[PDB]
């Protein structure tokens, strides 16, 4: 007999399918970001990793595995056949190269479809760029409905703009409340109206609050929030504990059910005056549904127009893309 | 008065040092993994990262700070000084390069130990860095630091690897698979077959030929796999990350908390098993908050303590031809 | 139209059900204990509280709910009536008032006979995780009648003995009771059995360095260690009435075993039948592989001739008491 | 050579002061609620118990102590004597008793508890839990000799997660983002800012101008009148709260010990505002951190609720200025 079966007495071999199971596609900077911020916030039972490149994807399965004994997530899987990643509650994509757009169409033809006949009830979280036009192909190729399908979107966004304000007030970001919604990136459009700490409006005490004119320059904020992003690159290559951090609060408040409010991107037909198939980032409560509902904020005429003109972008890129 | 004045009435202006600051000094693929572990773990109110290339260390803190909204330390801080490392608690070495490998290290140790000794001269030392265990006898020489407060990782990643394959042969979890590898980090490493067990069910004795070539069961290849391994990763994925970062940041904690608990950890050896050269190998140590306050004296058998001392011998052979 | 609706847009209204839910039968000093501990290692996504008492219920409940803001367990439900527990993971019996032994036995009995249908009735799937004295032969109980298969049934048994264990012998040592290795098993509670050949700190033997270990010649009296499990519990009764936080801690540490899946090693109660000699249907503390489907497997210690002796012994008097029990 | 000397070489005796100490005094079930919450928080590594019961305060401590295990606070102390008490932090004050009698009886023992945690913790932060807050903040500032920075009270904190709660089930979303502060008076005379209750920094006022009016349809003002209705009720329920308090004074202890600057609706004292001048303690968001709280927001607060506040602060003072130290 073996030294196992000496040691231990079997009741059951019987294996159930995974219960609380995340995919991450793409083992990038960014892909290997989320996957080492899920597992250090116990979220799924389950981690599957998916790329093309293999040796690079075994080598990221091996690293975290032998890290096993520091962590609450009893099994760690990968494989480029999409077989490791079936009954997945969340699948995130992460993967990535009007040329570059189309680059990551023709890849996601390829992913979408895989996840779909693995996880077909799974919610979709697109990380991969730009986020807000692959969440919308993601949703025309799966076929799901809105609700399972969610864009990583402003969330990095609100969270680069609140540890900015919170510098600038000697406050933690997490007691300084702010929205950058609409378009992920540099067109992103922050909200002056809802800039807050505890419960008192910035706006209200200081009207030149995100204006030209503004003797403090608040509006510089906002614009930090992109230069941020471009610095990073400039810096260091590339950005990925941020978004990696970003995206396991997104996992969390899905996974767990939570119910919370984020700036997510999400379909927007019927908003603002749009009227075309986009997805934009505005408040989102997150759940085991993926987005169930979301907040109507209240935007000035310049904040309205700001997010037509994004709509028009998108979809003026989208309606030429060939699936 | 300024909007920031105009919301928030300040009633005092004292401005107050971290109490629990880690820095960690590199920024490469190993010190970033420690960085991001010790911030998810909550170990810190203040972290400092350190390295010489100026970009790549001003992008990494940016990127962190970037995520500050998701963690719970209120400053990131870095520089090429090392004032921004002043006061720390714990400061984690893992600069330099992946007979000249040791070399080399040295000479980049003779720069880092003295500016961290001069600015946080109480810290803890917990060395990365390869060879980690004659990195730690550099860093404790040119310190000057009493031992119990230099410290090598060691055999800590060496033993969880261990037990995670341990784990995946018995169908268990890593936590409740225990089994000690002890002596150098890498290729002389020694599996202490005599302590590994399950429940305190001691394999040995259940399985007489655990760990000789007579075993049908070849477990001693479950040690040579843990030697092997990170050369397997190496080859994948050109650089082992985010185990060593896991594994840091479990001995930062038990450092950081006082918790006392034993970690397999490189430790000035002279004394134990014939050994009487200065040199640093892994033993199971009691880490807290004075680093290495306590070592276990396992009971080895012959031909154990016969390859710690050999390793000894090997590392005080590179070790008395080293120049500071 | 409303504020809400003004606030907020509505996708859909599909209702769905809990994926993580764990109910607590028995909204005592232990039930709540276990359930703040369960909270804020946060490993439901609902919470069911069941008891008798309905005034107390709704105000431990109300309580709980009114710090939802510092917890990410985002529904906490209760009631006298078990649909409240629909579809649980884990249910956790810790009814029944705390304590001679075979009229606690009666008493608790007549209980379960109510309790158990109902949440089989509603969770046929779940685990039953029973903490109710006395703790080994309330798992029986519970096994006959739920009808589960012996993997679902899981008794508290001496996890909590063999933590009190670690504490005290961490404290002698001056070391975590992480690092301090050790196994009380057997019947849990006056006769449960420190098994001295495992006792360890990174895997060196206490007992191979000191072999009058828990003998009667040991000159640093070792056997004292297990003696004070013994006696920490009567004093803890004495001190303030009753034990909350060490049991609450202990069965949040196996509710994270079984809800995470991680087949980590715990000693619980567990069907025995099969090993030492033992041939009735009796469960006792051996070391168990914990996860999602509750005890997968169990580890078969080594035993000396005495510690074997005294499994039998409990074995032998837990059967004597169960074989009389009318179902 | 013991078991302990063959199994374990020391290499330093040299013990240190513990550096993230926290004291609970009072191991009723406020206090024990702190304590666990306290402790599954990881924000201590050394926690100290202190009652006048003896027997109880052993047993609680005891009990603790055999979870250590399932924790990461190495060390878990009590006594009657407050030298247990040594270098903490931080020390919670949970200890406590017609009506102004009830005043008068907890300034008495704050009398002999105050004194002793001060001797033996001369640095430490102070968080008064013990009813009626407000008043007992300021006892415990008077007797302490304390700057006002380091004597917090527990104040509104309680209040607000409540308000957020019932505001979340209303809304169908979870409290931490729905957004909205109860200030002033602990208890009963507590203002709700309808000013300030948002979701995503989308004003509940704005878009409902009748928010927590008589004329609101929706009747929004009932949330708070449910927040005290609440606390009476969990009161006629079970016979006391322990829970909820006990996990909102782990969030406030969570801010001061690992200096986060975060924002919380706590009892500070408030003379300067809103008209006030006399010595009273009002709850409003302070920042808080390791020295405690270093700064206050200034909400900008309607006449009617700047009156409510003035009003609770004529009330506090006219006790105050009976009572005797
Ligand atoms: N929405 C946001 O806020 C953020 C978006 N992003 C995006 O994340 C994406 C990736 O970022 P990085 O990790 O830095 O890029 P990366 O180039 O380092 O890694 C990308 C990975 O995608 C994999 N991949 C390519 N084709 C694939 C396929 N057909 N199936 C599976 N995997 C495939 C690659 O092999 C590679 O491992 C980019 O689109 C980037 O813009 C990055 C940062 C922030
Ligand atoms: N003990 C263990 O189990 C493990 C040890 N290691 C070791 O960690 C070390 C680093 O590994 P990687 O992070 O992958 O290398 P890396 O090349 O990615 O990063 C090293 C960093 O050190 C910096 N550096 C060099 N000289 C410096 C100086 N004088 N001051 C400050 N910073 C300086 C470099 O600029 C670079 O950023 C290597 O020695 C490697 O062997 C790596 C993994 C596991
Ligand atoms: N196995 C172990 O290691 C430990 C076991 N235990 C046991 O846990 C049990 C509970 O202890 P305490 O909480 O202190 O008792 P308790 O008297 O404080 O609470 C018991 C609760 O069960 C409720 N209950 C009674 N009948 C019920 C029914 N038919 N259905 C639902 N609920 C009912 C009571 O109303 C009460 O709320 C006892 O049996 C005690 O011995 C306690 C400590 C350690
Ligand atoms: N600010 C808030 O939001 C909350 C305020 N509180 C208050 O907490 C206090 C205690 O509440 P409970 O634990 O339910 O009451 P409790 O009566 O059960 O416990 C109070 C403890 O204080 C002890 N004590 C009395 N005098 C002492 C002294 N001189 N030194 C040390 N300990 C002493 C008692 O022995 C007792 O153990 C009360 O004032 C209560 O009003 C309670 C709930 C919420
Ligand atoms: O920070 C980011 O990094 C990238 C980026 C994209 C476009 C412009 C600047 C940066 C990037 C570029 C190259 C390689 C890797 C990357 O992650 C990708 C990306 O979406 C972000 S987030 C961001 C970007 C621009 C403005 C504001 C924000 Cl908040
Ligand atoms: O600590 C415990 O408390 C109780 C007990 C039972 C029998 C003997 C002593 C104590 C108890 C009695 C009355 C009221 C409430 C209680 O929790 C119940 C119980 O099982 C334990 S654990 C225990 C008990 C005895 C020895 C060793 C251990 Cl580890
Ligand atoms: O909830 C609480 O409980 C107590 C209370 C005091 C006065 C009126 C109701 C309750 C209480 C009474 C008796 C015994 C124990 C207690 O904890 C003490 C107390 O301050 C609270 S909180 C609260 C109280 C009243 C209104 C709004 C709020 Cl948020």
Redesign the pocket.
């Known amino acids: 007999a073996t030294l196992k079966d000496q040691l231990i007495y079997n009741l059951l071999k019987e294996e159930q399918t995974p219960q609380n199971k995340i995919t991450v596609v793409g083992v990038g900077?960014?892909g290997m970001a989320c996957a080492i911020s899920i597992l250090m916030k116990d979220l799924a039972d389950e981690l599957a990793l998916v790329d093309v490149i293999e040796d690079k994807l075994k080598g990221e399965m091996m690293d975290l595995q032998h890290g096993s004994l520091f962590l609450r997530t009893p099994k760690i899987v990968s494989g480029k056949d999409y077989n490791v990643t079936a009954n997945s509650k969340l699948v995130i994509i992460t993967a990535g190269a009007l040329n570059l757009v189309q680059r990551n169409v023709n890849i996601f033809k390829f992913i979408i479809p895989n996840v779909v006949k693995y996880s077909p009830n799974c919610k979709l979280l697109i990380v991969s760029?730009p986020?807000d036009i692959l969440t919308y192909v993601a949703w025309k190729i799966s076929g799901f409905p809105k609700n399972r399908v969610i864009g990583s979107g402003?969330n990095?966004?609100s969270a680069?703009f609140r540890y900015l304000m919170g510098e600038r007030l000697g406050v933690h970001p997490l007691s300084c409340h702010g929205w950058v919604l609409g378009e992920?990136?540099?067109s992103?459009v922050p909200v002056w109206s809802g800039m807050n700490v505890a419960g008192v409006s910035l706006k209200t005490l200081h009207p030149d609050l995100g204006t030209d004119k503004d003797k403090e320059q608040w509006k510089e904020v906002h614009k930090q929030?992109?230069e941020?992003?471009?610095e990073?690159?400039k810096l260091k290559?590339?950005?990925?504990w941020?978004?990696g951090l970003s995206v396991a609060d997104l996992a969390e408040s899905i996974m767990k059910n939570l119910r919370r409010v984020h700036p997510v991107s999400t379909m927007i037909k019927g908003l603002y005056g749009i009227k075309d198939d986009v997805f934009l980032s505005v408040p989102c409560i997150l759940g085991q549904n993926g987005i169930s509902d979301l907040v109507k904020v209240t935007l000035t005429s310049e904040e309205e127009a700001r997010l037509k003109k994004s709509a028009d972008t998108l979809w003026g890129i989208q309606k030429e893309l060939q699936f």
């Open positions: 900077a960014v760029n986020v402003c990095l966004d680069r992920h990136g540099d992103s929030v992109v941020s992003a471009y990073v690159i290559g590339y950005t990925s941020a978004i």
